[PDB]
Amino acid sequence: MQDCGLPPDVPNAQPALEGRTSFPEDTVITYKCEESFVKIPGEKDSVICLKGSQWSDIEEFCNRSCEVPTRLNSASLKQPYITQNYFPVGTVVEYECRPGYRREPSLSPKLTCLQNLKWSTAVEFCKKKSCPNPGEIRNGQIDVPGGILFGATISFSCNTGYKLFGSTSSFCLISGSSVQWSDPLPECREIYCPAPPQIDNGIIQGERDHYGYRQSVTYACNKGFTMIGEHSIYCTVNNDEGEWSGPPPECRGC
Amino acid sequence: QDCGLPPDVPNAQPALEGRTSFPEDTVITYKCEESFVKIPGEKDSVICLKGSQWSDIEEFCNRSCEVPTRLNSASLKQPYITQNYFPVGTVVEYECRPGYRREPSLSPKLTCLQNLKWSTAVEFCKKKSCPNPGEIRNGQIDVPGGILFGATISFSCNTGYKLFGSTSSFCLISGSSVQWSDPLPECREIYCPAPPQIDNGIIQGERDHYGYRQSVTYACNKGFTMIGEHSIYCTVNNDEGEWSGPPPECRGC
Incomplete structure (x- = not known):
């Protein structure tokens, strides 16, 4: 009869039947690989209902591959691997350094898809x-x-x-x-410390324009005046601010 | 032949030894009364002579100041330093002691005043x-x-x-x-002691000497994590140099 029955059973693939069990001549049925399976590039993925109520032949077209190589911050997949998704066991891809990384010549920039469906151990083939x-x-x-x-x-x-x-x-x-x-x-x-203070009836000996850390200013009392206090003070510096070590002496008379 | 009481001398008193009669050739000496000093080169005694007559004696006591009070800034010059007779008007001179100096604008002289006191003292000799x-x-x-x-x-x-x-x-x-x-x-x-080195880490740009408030910064070698303060500073634990605390540690990963 001008109709085929169920299409062939393909290992690891499922056909899209769209709710029917009988198919008219020239009907084309496409298969989708099952979970954990990827279709093999360059292979048929469909059958066709020919004369005599016979389906065309189809061979297993699915595998069995690693996942897309994990994202590295140091390296990016080279072409053509960067656009691929089919990686059966044994597949080796190559990387190239991103910026600002550079190659570590002693190390391979290649990863291999292992029998367990995992990529080989990662080394620092691209360094900072x-x-x-x-x-x-x-x-x-x-x-x-x-x-x-x-x-x-x-x-x-x-x-x-x-x-x-x-x-x-x-x-x-x-x-x-x-x-x-x-x-x-x-x-x-x-x-710089603030300008040193002047004192009544006394002077600063050779006052400088600017006083830095630990620099000192020496005082002297005018004739007839007695010094009471430190003969000199120095610049202290804390939290980026200058400050004199203490008050200037006094010059008392008489 | 014995003389009677010796003559009355103004401002002086005779030493009689409780006697009222004195034999010929007896010599009686007078002492000036309070505030008075004998006048140098003047007679202060009488002698009982023949005819029961005393020899003549004239007033020999002048009101005098006392020996100047001791000053710590100056000492009396010669000859005043050995004198004791200072009638009104007498002026003495001083000279500085050590460690004092003369105040040029001032007089180093004192005058005996009418009241028997020395003039007002000024700082003619200054420290x-x-x-x-x-x-x-x-x-x-x-x-x-x-x-x-x-x-x-x-x-x-x-x-x-x-x-x-x-x-x-x-x-x-x-x-x-x-x-x-x-x-x-x-x-x-x-100076603080040389800063301590740490296992698997270094001191960044170590110096030969570290003084107060100077710091030393540490860094761990590649593959180690620092544990503790990154830098320490030179404190002064009086009067010794001491680091603010222990250096950090480097833990291998």
């Missing part, structure tokens, strides 16, 4: 690029807690008596073709 | 001053009460420095002048 030597801050310091490779953070400080002007930290971030420091080296600026 | 103390590098000099003869000053070293030498000085008289009893001490920077 390094940022330039951070250098130095005059009268300050640079803290490098964990190297200077891509993704690293460094911090800046100014020594006692100096004030930081600029950025307090920097990060090694990807910059176009390479990796560079997010921020430039800041500046450590000398902290 | 000498020791030289300016100077400065102590990284330290301070406290001058509580001037730098004149007898004064005391004290020395201290700023935070982070240790005093080596004298802690005070006193303005002493030294021969022909006044000088500080002790020379200035020195203020030397205190």
Whole structure:
């Protein structure tokens, strides 16, 4: 009769019958691979109802493959693997470094689909690029807690008596073709105490324009006046603010 | 042949030894009364002569000031320093003791006034001053009460420095002048012990010396996680250098 019966049973595949058990001549039935199965590229996935109520032949066209290789931050799959989804056991794909990573020549940038349907063990075939030597801050310091490779953070400080002007930290971030420091080296600026206080009936010996950390100012009483107190005071520096060590002496008469 | 009572001398009293009759050749001496001093080169005694007659005697006592009171700034010059006769109008001169100096604008003279008192005393001899103390590098000099003869000053070293030498000085008289009893001490920077090294980590840019408030920053080697403070600083546990705390640790991952 001008109709075929049920199409052939294909291992690991299911046909789309659309609710019927009888099919007219020239009917084309397509099979879909079952769960955990991927169709083999370049193979038929359908049958056709021919004359004599006979279906055309069809061979197993499904496998048995690894999942799409897991997403790496250091490397991306090369072409053509990057567009593929069929990875039977034994399949080896190749990677290439992303930015800002570079190849570790001693290591293979390849992964193999194993018998258990899993990709081989991942090694660091693509490593983190390094940022330039951070250098130095005059009268300050640079803290490098964990190297200077891509993704690293460094911090800046100014020594006692100096004030930081600029950025307090920097990060090694990807910059176009390479990796560079997010921020430039800041500046450590000398902290000045307020102008030293004058005293009644006394003077400052050779008063300077500016007083920095630990610098001192010496007092002297005018003729006929007696000194009572510290002959000199010095500049203390805390939390980036200058402040004299204590009050200036007194010059009492007479 | 015995004389009777000797003559009455104004402002003087004779020493009679309770006697009222005196044999020939008896010599009687008079003593000036209070406030009076005998006049140098004048007779103060009489002698009983023949004819039961005393020899003549004239007033020999002049009202006089007392020996000038002792001053600590100056001493009487010669010859006043050995004198005791100071009638009204007498002016004596002083000279400075050590460690005092003359106040040029003033007179070093005292006059015996009509009331038998010496004129008002002024500071004609003033205390000498020791030289300016100077400065102590990284330290301070406290001058509580001037730098004149007898004064005391004290020395201290700023935070982070240790005093080596004298802690005070006193303005002493030294021969022909006044000088500080002790020379200035020195203020030397205190150093903390060398910072400790840590397993699997380093000291970032270690220095040869660390002083007060100076810090040392640590960093762990690749593949280790730091545990504890990243940097420590040089404190001064008086008067010793000491690190603020233990260095961090590096734990292998």
